[PDB]
Each structure stands twice: as structure tokens, then as C-alpha cells.
Amino acid sequence: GGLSQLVAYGAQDVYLTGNPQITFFKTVYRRYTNFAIESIQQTINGSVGFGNKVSTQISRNGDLITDIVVEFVLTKGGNGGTTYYPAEELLQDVELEIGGQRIDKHYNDWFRTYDALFRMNDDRYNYRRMTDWVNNELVGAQKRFYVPLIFFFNQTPGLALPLIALQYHEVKLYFTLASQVQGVNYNGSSAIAGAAQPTMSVWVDYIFLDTQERTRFAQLPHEYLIEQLQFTGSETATPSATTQASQNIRLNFNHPTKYLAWNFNNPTNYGQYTALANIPGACSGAGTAAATVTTPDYGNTGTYNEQLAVLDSAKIQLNGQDRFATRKGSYFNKVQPYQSIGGVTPAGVYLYSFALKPAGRQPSGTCNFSRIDNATLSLTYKTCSIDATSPAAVLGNTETVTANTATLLTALNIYAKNYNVLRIMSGMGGLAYA
Template sequence: MGGGLLQLVAYGAQDIYLTGNPQITFFKIVYRRHTNFSMECIRQTISGSATASDTYITTGSIIISRNGDLLSQIYVKADQETTSGINGDYLIEDVEIEIGGQRIDKQYREWNQIWTELITPSSKAEGFKYMTGGFNNTLVTGGLSVKGGTSQQAIMYPLQFWFCRNIGLALPLIALQYHDVKLKINWGSGAAGSGMSRSGSNAVTPSFEVWCDYIYLDTDERRRFAQVSHEYLIEQLQLQKEGSSRENFKLNFDHPIKELIWTVPTSSTEADTIISQKMKLEINGHDRFAFQDREYFQIKQPYIHHTSIPGYNIKELENPRMLTYPIELLQNVNVSDSSPDPGEVWIGAESSDISVITLGSATSGESTPKVGDILLIAVSNEAASGTTGSKTGVHTVTGLTSTTVFNVTPGLPETTNEDNVSMSIIARVQNPQSRCSQLSRDIFVYSFSLNPEDHQPSGTCNFSRIESAKFLLDSSGTISNIYAVNYNVLRIMSGMGGLAYAI
């Protein structure tokens, strides 16, 4: 008897719980037939402004055309600017959706950056960043026709409303005969240094397009959608703007909330951000949980409840990451053969070798060499004797007084303190970067839900029934914005739509 047959007959009482009275087989695939449908992407007409300004915020509005039966995804498109480049993160400052003149939801630039950081899997992160023009490089300089320039023609930024993220929540335009669906968009600023310009040095004024994905239903299903009433469980976003430094942040939210997300400024000063402070949530005077370090909210909560951990939350890497723009520390300074003066690096002249002795005091603005940095060091001989030559070496920082010795070009005389040295940081271990955007803020998460990305509810806290909710810190810190994701019900009947619970 073969081993496979032995496995078949090795059947005991415990196997009854696994294979007794079987209900499925792995060896006959089962599928279900679906209703007939088709999809099409159609450009919308923008009223008001469809162009960014380099001096003020412009506004555009769109009444969604009734080209199809259902509305699913919405994209904002702009041609890639070929001199300075466009960063899609900053195309939209905020966007609001109305049905029949009633605001249903409003979303913001920072929220779109946060949400894509949390829900985009690693396999799609680079592609999303490319699609939205989020790379921070200089490939755009010189235009598409120049060798080495970017080949990107356009950038597309998806909106994140409830019906955009779940095809089962596609908005039934066919059932809204008497109510229009309207978008109100505040476009981002194209001013130099505003963020929309990838180079940062030049203003950009791109023109925008809005595209919608429509679904066409077959006759029977189309008739059902038009005639019956609909109730959709939808998600909405609430925003509470902060910005001051304190220990107590009152939460002014309503409705059943499944998740709280907040951002903090980037700063090295404790009171201006959250570094070592511990946090907790207090509800009606009772602790929801004990004080927790920031890693609980930045790493553990996203790890458990979301697809991905925001890239900027990860402060250290296993291996150094190359910098897009090297940080220049020294430029044509003399070699030192004694202890360095304040603000200098000791590049010791030791016979025919170069020795990096002390790094702790080297600065470039706010940049100081850190453990794990890789330094590029160039030595050029400009001694009075007229001897010329040069040497380039790489130094890995293993401590603030670490030493690396590398030989100068063979045949050159020993290095003297007349020789010029340039040094830059070219790679870092401590170089946090967002995965899908250019957001440079820590993202904190606390979820009441087991799976907050799913439409199926898996836990909420009804803030409408709570008298007092607060974030407490054990010492003063600063929170920029607090977001709450809540459930609501959208009712559509008799050709009109509205919320069951007011916002």
C-alpha cells in the first residue's frame, strides 16, 4: 500500500470535525453567474476654474453627468509639467460631494495622503506614487524630449469617497432622477514652494480634468435600480483641526466611529510634536486604555488593522537608503591634523592616508551625520608645491568618533593640511519617507474596528452617545489634525437622496 493510501485510511475521531459530512470539494471549481453590465470612463465638465493659480486657491465644481446608471471611481487628471514637474499629492486642497444640495462627505489633501499610506499594499506602492506624480526627483527637468527626462505624460489622482472604494456601493444615478450629484473642489496652489511643483523652485499652473467610471446595467436590473428604494451604509470623514501644544485634546465628533487617525508636525522639539510623550484616550472620564508610547499608535495599530504601515512612521531601516539629494557637509575645506574647531570635522593627515576621526560636530543646517550614514569624501591636492592629484573614498559612520582610513592615489606625496576636502552624506539608515506620497508627518492610528478598511462593520464607538472624549498626553505635545471615520446611512427613494442622520 502506498503512502498516499495510508494517509487516506488513517482516519480517526478527530477527523470528523474536519472532514465529516463534507460541504465543499477542492477539485471541482464552483462559480456563480453575474448580471450583465459594462463600464466606461467619461470626462466631466468643470464649472468655475479648471486651472491652478500661483497666487491664490481656485475653485471648480462638477455636476456629475448622467451618462451611466451607476457611478464608481473618480479621478483627477493633469498633464505632467515638463520643466518643474507636478506632484499629484497637491492637486486638490479639499473636495466635497453633495446630493440634492446636501453635503454628504468632504475629504482633504492630507487625508488622501494618509489613507493611501494605510491601504496601499507594498506591491502597488511604487506604481501608485508614479501614477500620482509623487516621486521627488529631477527627471522632469528639460522636458520629455530630452534624453534622461521623464517619460510620464499625465498624472491621475483617485478620490477616496465611499463609492469610489467599493464597487458594491456604486452610486445609483438611475435612482436619483430629481437630485444632482455635485463635486466642489478647491484646487491646490501652484506657487513656487507650495508642494505642487516637484522642483519647488518654479511655479506651475496645470489645467485639470475630472474623469468618472460609469457602470451600465442590463434592462431588468436597470429597471429594479430605478424603481426600488435604496439604503447604503456609507463612510464619512470628520476633521478636527488642532495645532497648539498642550496635554489635553477634546474630541468633538458624532456618529458611530470606527477609527481615529491623527497627524503631528515634524520637529525635533518635544513640545512641538510627539516624541517621547505617552498618550491615552479618555471617554466620559474613564480610561479607554492605559498610557501608550507612540509606537503603539504608529506601528502596532496599523500593523494589526491595516494593509500597510505608513512609511514615514518607520524611522530606521536595516540598510542605508540612497538620498535623492546628497547633504553637503564640507566644501573645499583644508585638511586638519589636530583636534577640530567647533563645527568642523577632523580629516587627519596621516602619511599617505586619509583618516576620518571625528564626525559629531559636522553640520549642514540642521543635518548632522548620524550612525549608519554613508559619507562620500573627496580629497584634492592643492598644496603650495604644485603637486596635484585626488582621492575619493566612502566612510560608514559607526559612531560619533569612528575612524575610517583609505589610501590616497598611489604615487602621490603624503597629504598635508593644504589639501582641500569635500564631504557629503549620500545614504542614510535614519531617513523616513512616505511610501505613496510626500507627506512628511507621523501618522497615529487608533481603531475601534477589527478591520476598518472593510465595508462590513467590525466594531465602532458611538460618539453621539458620549458626553466627553479626550486625548491625554503625559506632557505637552502638538497634534496637527484629528480625523474620525464614521458610519452613516444614505437613503435613496422617489428619485431623491439624503442622509438618515445629519452631520
């Protein structure tokens, strides 16, 4: 039996079984501060609706705050396949304020970008279930949606906001709701008559601690290592013929950055990062005579066929010197997230990491843009010479060209995820660097 393996002891084992340190079959657990978690509803200040801006103030029901889940009730105006992440399209942005200072702000496209890069197969499908319709539901169906916030303090309890230590500073969230949500109140850009206004509520996860730590938290100062999102928008030049565009985009960032991520999108259709084409899942009606390449088959908008993406190559340059030699676009869509995250990134979303494992929270390498002159991201575009309606060319052409409908991906969104420090002292909170 297995005893025949134990007798097989040798010289190579002085590095393995000699003077052992770990017993694998008797585990030691750590004792932990007694706590309980509950989530409590917050009150939304303002009228909830399409294009409205509302806010909320987190009541001091507890000791620390972890995750926050925004829920929406939407009524769809289309049939199955006519929606694509409608809860997130509506959640246009969320601003995080602690004590009067801006700590973060996330956008609807950031939520889609974050999902596209950092969530895995089962939690992404789940995420999709929480924010979209996935069972072909038809016109008039209603669903309650849940959008967890990505803010630093939300998915790792170790950064929970210490309200017990912030008795003087309020924590507030400002919510911008989109005026146009495809498949809910607009069909493409056309208004859907009879569309209902959304109903929204925000649930906040409160932590209650035992007496002994609540005191320690209340009395001692704290330095939390927290994350921020930096974002500005740009526009692209995406030609159809005779040339490959090349843009040198200024990266206006200023904190130790774990990674840069960016995408190319058509602002009319939320989450569309690739060209439309007359191939399965690539446009409305694809495969039959009614196929049109100006409107997506929305529920299948996300694809993995990078042939429909516009990025031929990209390079980050710091103070006139290349950060790395030019890499092809598929490098940033499939290899960097393989190395850095270990999941799949859909076509049209790109990542370059500075960190070894940016998906985690333990710092593992940063680019500090506060101590440079100029950083740019050079983007080389594919020539959009392919007829989007001819599968023979869409599915069978060369690397450096894409579909003529790709020229609509004129919006460039470059994100940076950085570290900062949130200091808490005497009931007051705020950033150490800004």
C-alpha cells in the same frame, strides 16, 4: 504516494473529513447581472489653476457611479527628489454633494494619511507613481497624474451611487486647488519663475446594467451603508527643553466611528510628519557639509524612523474615564495598524481602531460619539532636545526625546471615519442622520 496519507484516517478526523460539506476541487460560481463599465469625462466649471476653486456635475450617462479619477498635468520646477506627492498637494480638498446635502469632504492631508495607513506595498508604490515623479526626473519634465477619490462609493462597487434612482437630485464635486504646491510652483516658500498652471480633468466610472435590474433600481427605495470623514484642525505645543507637553484635545465627532487617525505636520512642507535631521533621507543635503535641517530632501520626506516623531504617548478618554490605559506613541504607529490593517504605517502617522478590521467595509465595531458627553485625545510630547545636525545624537538617544527641528510640526490633524446611511427614494437622495 499521497494515498498513504488517505489511509491515515483517525478519530481526530471526525471534525475534519466526516460528513463533509465542502468539496474543494469543484468550485461553484454565482451568476451575475449583465453589466458594462466605461469612464466618461466630466466638464470642470471654473478656471483651473493654483489657488482656484472649481467644480463639476456628474452627467447622467449611466445607472450607477463607482470610482472617480482626477487627472492633472504638472510641469516640475525642481530636480529629482524636490517633489513629494505633488498631485495630492495640489488637490487641496474635494467636497461630495448629493441633492443639495453635504455627504463628505476629503483633504489633501487626508489623502496622504489614508495612503499612509490603508494602502499596501504594491498599490502604495503604484499610488506614488500616479501622484509623484519616481525616476529622478529633472527640471522642466512633465507628467500626467491620477488621483483616485477615496469617497465611499469609489473603491467598492457595492456602494455605487444609483443615478438611475436619482433623476431629481444632482451629484456634484467641488475641487479646491492649492495656491502653493512644493516643487511645482514653489521651492520651499519661494516662487518658481515660469511655473506653468496645472491642467485638470475628471473622469467618472459609469456602470450600465441590463434592463431587468435597471427597472428594479429605478422603482424600489434604497438604503446604502456609506462612510464619512470627519475633520477639524488643531495646533500643538512642541517644546525643546525642560518639559514634555501634554494636550487634552477635544474630539468633536458625532457618528459610529470605525477608527481615529491623526498626524503631526509642518504646514509649509506637504506630507512632512517627522523632524528633519542630518541623516540619510531626513533632510536636504544630508550626510555632507551642505546638509541643512530646515528643508527636507522632499522625495524622501516619508520615513519609518519614529525617533524623529513627537508623540511619546496617547490616550483616548470618554466622559472622564480612560478608553484604554495610556499607550506609547509607537503603539499607534506600528501595532494598531498591524492588528487592524496589516501594512506599514510611516513615522508620524498614528491610528487607533474601534473596528476589528477597519480596512474593510463590513462593519466590525464602532464608537458612537453621538451618545457621549466628551471625548478627548491626550497627547504626550517628546522633548525636542536633540541637535538635528548631529547623527551621534539623532541616531543614538533615548525614547522620550527627539530633534529640535521637531518643534515645527505644529499642526495636529485628527480624522474620524464613520458610518452613515444614504437613503434614496422617488429620485431623491439624502442622509438619514446628520
